[PDB]
Coordinates of all heavy atoms in Angstrom, one line a residue:
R36 N 42.7 -55.2 141.3 CA 43.7 -56.2 141.4 C 44.4 -56.5 140.1 O 45.4 -57.3 140.0 CB 43.1 -57.5 141.9 CG 42.6 -58.4 140.9 CD 41.2 -58.0 140.5 NE 40.1 -58.6 141.4 CZ 39.6 -59.8 141.2 NH1 39.9 -60.4 140.1 NH2 38.6 -60.3 142.0
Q37 N 44.1 -55.7 139.0 CA 44.8 -55.7 137.7 C 46.1 -55.0 137.9 O 46.2 -54.0 138.7 CB 44.0 -55.1 136.6 CG 42.7 -55.9 136.3 CD 42.8 -57.4 136.0 OE1 42.1 -58.2 136.7 NE2 43.8 -57.8 135.3
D38 N 47.1 -55.4 137.2 CA 48.3 -54.6 137.0 C 48.1 -53.7 135.7 O 47.9 -54.2 134.6 CB 49.5 -55.5 136.7 CG 50.9 -54.8 136.4 OD1 50.9 -53.5 136.8 OD2 51.8 -55.3 135.9
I39 N 48.0 -52.4 136.0 CA 47.6 -51.5 135.0 C 48.8 -50.6 134.4 O 48.6 -49.7 133.6 CB 46.5 -50.5 135.5 CG1 47.0 -49.7 136.7 CG2 45.2 -51.3 135.7 CD1 46.1 -48.5 137.0
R40 N 50.0 -51.0 134.8 CA 51.2 -50.4 134.4 C 51.4 -50.1 132.9 O 51.9 -49.1 132.5 CB 52.4 -51.2 134.9 CG 52.9 -51.0 136.4 CD 53.8 -52.0 136.8 NE 54.6 -51.6 138.0 CZ 55.7 -52.2 138.4 NH1 56.3 -53.2 137.8 NH2 56.3 -51.7 139.5
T41 N 50.9 -51.1 132.1 CA 51.0 -51.0 130.6 C 49.8 -50.8 129.8 O 49.9 -50.9 128.6 CB 51.8 -52.3 130.1 OG1 51.0 -53.4 130.5 CG2 53.2 -52.4 130.7
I42 N 48.6 -50.7 130.5 CA 47.4 -50.5 129.7 C 47.3 -49.2 128.9 O 48.0 -48.3 129.2 CB 46.1 -50.6 130.6 CG1 45.9 -49.4 131.6 CG2 46.1 -52.0 131.4 CD1 44.6 -49.2 132.1
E43 N 46.5 -49.2 127.8 CA 46.4 -48.0 126.9 C 45.8 -46.8 127.6 O 45.1 -46.9 128.6 CB 45.6 -48.3 125.6 CG 46.5 -48.9 124.5 CD 47.6 -48.0 123.9 OE1 47.8 -46.8 124.5 OE2 48.2 -48.3 123.0
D44 N 46.2 -45.7 127.1 CA 45.8 -44.3 127.6 C 44.2 -44.3 127.7 O 43.7 -43.8 128.7 CB 46.2 -43.2 126.7 CG 47.7 -42.8 127.1 OD1 48.0 -42.6 128.2 OD2 48.4 -42.7 126.1
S45 N 43.5 -44.9 126.7 CA 42.1 -44.9 126.7 C 41.5 -45.6 127.9 O 40.5 -45.1 128.5 CB 41.6 -45.7 125.4 OG 42.0 -47.0 125.3
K46 N 42.0 -46.7 128.3 CA 41.5 -47.4 129.5 C 41.9 -46.7 130.8 O 41.1 -46.7 131.7 CB 41.8 -48.9 129.5 CG 41.0 -49.6 128.5 CD 41.0 -51.1 128.6 CE 39.9 -51.7 127.8 NZ 40.4 -52.9 127.0
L47 N 43.1 -46.1 130.8 CA 43.6 -45.4 131.9 C 42.7 -44.2 132.2 O 42.4 -43.8 133.3 CB 45.1 -45.0 131.8 CG 45.7 -44.3 133.1 CD1 45.7 -45.2 134.3 CD2 47.1 -43.9 132.7
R48 N 42.3 -43.5 131.1 CA 41.4 -42.3 131.1 C 40.1 -42.6 131.7 O 39.5 -41.9 132.5 CB 41.3 -41.7 129.6 CG 40.4 -40.5 129.6 CD 41.0 -39.3 130.4 NE 40.2 -38.1 130.4 CZ 39.3 -37.8 131.4 NH1 39.1 -38.7 132.4 NH2 38.6 -36.6 131.4
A49 N 39.6 -43.8 131.3 CA 38.3 -44.3 131.8 C 38.4 -44.6 133.2 O 37.4 -44.5 134.0 CB 37.9 -45.5 131.0
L50 N 39.5 -45.2 133.7 CA 39.8 -45.6 135.0 C 39.8 -44.4 136.0 O 39.2 -44.5 137.1 CB 41.0 -46.4 135.2 CG 41.0 -47.9 134.9 CD1 42.3 -48.5 135.0 CD2 40.0 -48.7 135.8
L51 N 40.3 -43.3 135.5 CA 40.2 -42.0 136.2 C 38.8 -41.6 136.3 O 38.4 -41.1 137.4 CB 41.0 -40.9 135.5 CG 41.0 -39.5 136.1 CD1 41.4 -39.6 137.6 CD2 42.0 -38.6 135.3
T52 N 38.0 -41.7 135.3 CA 36.6 -41.4 135.3 C 35.8 -42.2 136.3 O 35.0 -41.7 137.0 CB 35.9 -41.5 133.9 OG1 36.6 -40.6 133.1 CG2 34.4 -41.3 134.0
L53 N 36.2 -43.5 136.4 CA 35.6 -44.4 137.4 C 35.9 -43.9 138.8 O 34.9 -43.8 139.6 CB 36.2 -45.8 137.2 CG 35.7 -46.9 138.2 CD1 34.2 -47.2 138.1 CD2 36.5 -48.1 138.0
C54 N 37.1 -43.5 139.1 CA 37.5 -43.0 140.4 C 36.7 -41.7 140.7 O 36.3 -41.6 141.8 CB 39.0 -42.8 140.5 SG 40.0 -44.3 140.4
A55 N 36.6 -40.9 139.7 CA 35.9 -39.6 140.0 C 34.4 -39.8 140.2 O 33.8 -39.2 141.2 CB 36.0 -38.7 138.7
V56 N 33.8 -40.7 139.5 CA 32.4 -41.1 139.8 C 32.2 -41.6 141.2 O 31.3 -41.2 142.0 CB 31.7 -42.1 138.7 CG1 30.4 -42.5 139.1 CG2 31.8 -41.4 137.3
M57 N 33.1 -42.5 141.6 CA 33.1 -43.1 142.9 C 33.2 -42.0 144.1 O 32.6 -42.1 145.1 CB 34.1 -44.2 143.0 CG 33.7 -45.4 142.3 SD 35.0 -46.8 142.2 CE 34.8 -47.4 144.0
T58 N 34.1 -41.0 143.9 CA 34.4 -40.0 144.9 C 33.1 -39.3 145.2 O 32.9 -38.9 146.4 CB 35.4 -39.0 144.5 OG1 35.0 -38.2 143.5 CG2 36.7 -39.7 144.2
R59 N 32.3 -39.0 144.3 CA 31.1 -38.3 144.4 C 29.9 -39.0 144.9 O 28.9 -38.4 145.5 CB 30.6 -37.6 143.1 CG 31.6 -36.6 142.6 CD 31.0 -35.8 141.4 NE 31.1 -36.5 140.1 CZ 32.1 -36.7 139.4 NH1 33.3 -36.3 139.7 NH2 32.0 -37.4 138.2
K60 N 29.9 -40.4 144.9 CA 29.1 -41.2 145.7 C 29.3 -41.3 147.1 O 28.3 -41.7 147.9 CB 29.0 -42.7 145.0 CG 28.8 -42.7 143.5 CD 27.5 -41.8 143.2 CE 27.8 -41.2 141.8 NZ 26.6 -40.4 141.3
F61 N 30.5 -41.0 147.6 CA 30.8 -41.0 149.1 C 30.4 -39.7 149.7 O 30.4 -38.7 149.0 CB 32.3 -41.3 149.3 CG 32.7 -42.7 148.9 CD1 33.6 -42.9 147.9 CD2 32.3 -43.8 149.6 CE1 34.0 -44.2 147.5 CE2 32.7 -45.1 149.2 CZ 33.5 -45.3 148.2
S62 N 30.1 -39.8 151.0 CA 29.9 -38.5 151.8 C 31.2 -37.9 152.1 O 32.2 -38.5 151.9 CB 29.1 -38.9 153.1 OG 30.0 -39.7 153.9

């Protein structure tokens, strides 16, 4: 629910990692 339009590359990079970890937890 955050607006991430303007967040730093560092946090965006980590957010991608979050999504990747999540994809591998699903069947």
